Design a protein around this ligand. Sequence first.
Ligand SMILES: [Mg+2]
Ligand SMILES: [Mg+2]
Length: 803
Amino acid sequence: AFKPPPRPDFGTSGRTIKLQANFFEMDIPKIDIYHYELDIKPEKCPRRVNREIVEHMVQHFKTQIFRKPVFDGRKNLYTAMPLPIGRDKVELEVTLPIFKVSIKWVSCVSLQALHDALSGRLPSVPFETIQALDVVMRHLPSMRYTPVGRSFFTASEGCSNPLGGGREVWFGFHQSVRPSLWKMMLNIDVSATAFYKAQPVIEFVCEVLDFKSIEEQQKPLTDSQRVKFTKEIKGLKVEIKRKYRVCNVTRRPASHQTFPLVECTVAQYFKDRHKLVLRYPHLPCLQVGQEQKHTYLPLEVCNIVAGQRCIKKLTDNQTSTMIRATARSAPDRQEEISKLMRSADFNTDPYVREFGIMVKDEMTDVTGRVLQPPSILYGGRNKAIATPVQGVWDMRNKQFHTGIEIKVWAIACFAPQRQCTEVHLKSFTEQLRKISRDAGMPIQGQPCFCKYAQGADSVEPMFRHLKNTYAGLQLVVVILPGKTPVYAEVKRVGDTVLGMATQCVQMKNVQRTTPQTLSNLCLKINVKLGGVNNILLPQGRPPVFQQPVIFLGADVTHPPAGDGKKPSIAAVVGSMDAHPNRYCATVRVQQHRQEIIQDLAAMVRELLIQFYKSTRFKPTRIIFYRDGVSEGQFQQVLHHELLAIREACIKLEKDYQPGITFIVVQKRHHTRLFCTDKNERVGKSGNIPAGTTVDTKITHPTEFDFYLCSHAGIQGTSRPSHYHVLWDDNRFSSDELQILTYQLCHTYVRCTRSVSIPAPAYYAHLVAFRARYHLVDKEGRDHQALAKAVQVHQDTLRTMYFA
RNA sequence: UUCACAUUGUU
RNA sequence: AAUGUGAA
Ligand SMILES: [Mg+2]
Ligand SMILES: [Mg+2]
């Protein structure tokens, strides 16, 4: 239950395609790097400050110690050659315009062993070596650019990309060192993010408060303005030589604001001590440093410090500007990455030079294979077969495999009548019934109930009435004016309080209908009512379907940044037929920002029981798609969760041991794939075609992983999903697993398109999202409360309410 | 809330 | 959540 299976073989299905990857081959010497531990006192210093300290230590003690070491920013120092220190732990006094730095030799890192690991010779890739290489490649840019995670950012020279509110777009790149079947690879991608302008605080005030000039406000500021500004600058760093974090903004103007020196004002203090007359004394001051102290600084003497990323949310306009700034088609992105790498000068990096490393300035050529899409089987009387072309198909002249006959339904319109009239509702009903009839989901008549309502308060009593009054009620269609807290309430009542099927529609989609919109809407409706939209062509499925098999999807969605308290949400879905089409859901609230699904065993047990209830089979196989786990958590996650699945099986039945395949689905990596041949590009975005598969050259040297871009690239540059097999009792071959995954990408019911991840994982996402909606504004006893919030009604348990 | 894709995620 | 590109 510990180590990931070796790659069984290489895929052979599908026609070849020439690709380029944003992986750049690295030359690594055979020598041994030497690793030393570093302890810096005081120990609370920022990583930047630590790097500065070590740099200064090397420059001040260059004599008879040390030539060019690299530092990870905390406790790790690597050197290409040994240091005249042996294993001795020495204490160095470093004074920087006060720091005690102890150096103890830890170990040796053999790059030769890494060469053994990249070949077949060594079973595993030694992580210490990878980390060493990463510290090497990260040393220089960490002190030249602004490090953000594994990326680096900078103010692009010659360009200004203002966002408003004292913010601008900084451009940069993700850089990571990764082992491959081929060589060591430098993964390089371009990115952009919001940073605070390094402008005077006065101009920051002007941009925040919308002043063209500071003279627009000659008064001391309204409380609204002072608060609006306080919320913007609080937490940011300003300077005068001296760095300060802004903890507050004084209420009183600099002329009036006082402090004890006996009391003295700020304006006066800057007159007497600094010979400074304040040109804007009517404006307030910034309280900096410790908030228990009384250090107040005028706005005029302060600048926003450069290199501070905007953590706060961007406004709608700032976001629009951001997207316009960073919108790149696939070829445009390929060229920007290439331009970046050619101008990067990695091989002239003195620290890269010290460790004898060479980096190839060209993208790696890779051969992909474009898998054939599955045929999609429909129902009705004509039993049409749809053939996905470039990851897309449609439902024109097609009927659902199993269409629900709708006899009893209602309409609840929370939109104002003056905006969404009865005529609109009637026309909408006619159109929807036409489309529904075409799709094989006949809405046989008019709704038995159609009334207007207002506010969330009216939801529960209206729904309670509906459930009491109309026997055999199948659906309530809820018309919403737009973004409103009524949606969350309709879902709370419907899914968790009364167990009623709802379908919400925006007012604008009722006022102006299109065949396509109504079609997709009919997809959702048919699914919610227990229907089967379509199935994979039975004879076109891989042989895994010859025995009972269940498909599980799992995801943990986490609370937004700058948060605590809000729980993480874990969602697991399971297939309930042989198609596979129908799914059931399980969802739990859990510890804040925990990736490991805590209650997995119980969830899986539920899903297995329900599977048996639906199919009268016990799965001989369990295929588990696990979204969002990064490499650094493979071991922990697999250890807990695999054992959880096994436990769920054992407790269900003595000696019930279905084979488990554990795949990690990853969409948030930095691997990009591009068409080498321009004539292979698809659409306006110029992306690789749906079905593109890569399991060579840039993948793992020993393990079972692959890239599958299962979706059509509509806009920007596609993200090919990465699949990493952490465990496989079923002994899948690459071909069968890749084809299975791809086919699963075609079973997603909310659209007639192949999606970017297999339907189970996507459904898991939808479930966690709905749970987020159930928990809106609700976040021992509190865990019980939150658990209750996400617990769906009994009549909702066997449904696809999350569609 | 029709949907997918993509982006931001010592004063 | 925001913002874009699109679809029978
Ligand atoms: Mg997740
Ligand atoms: Mg959106």
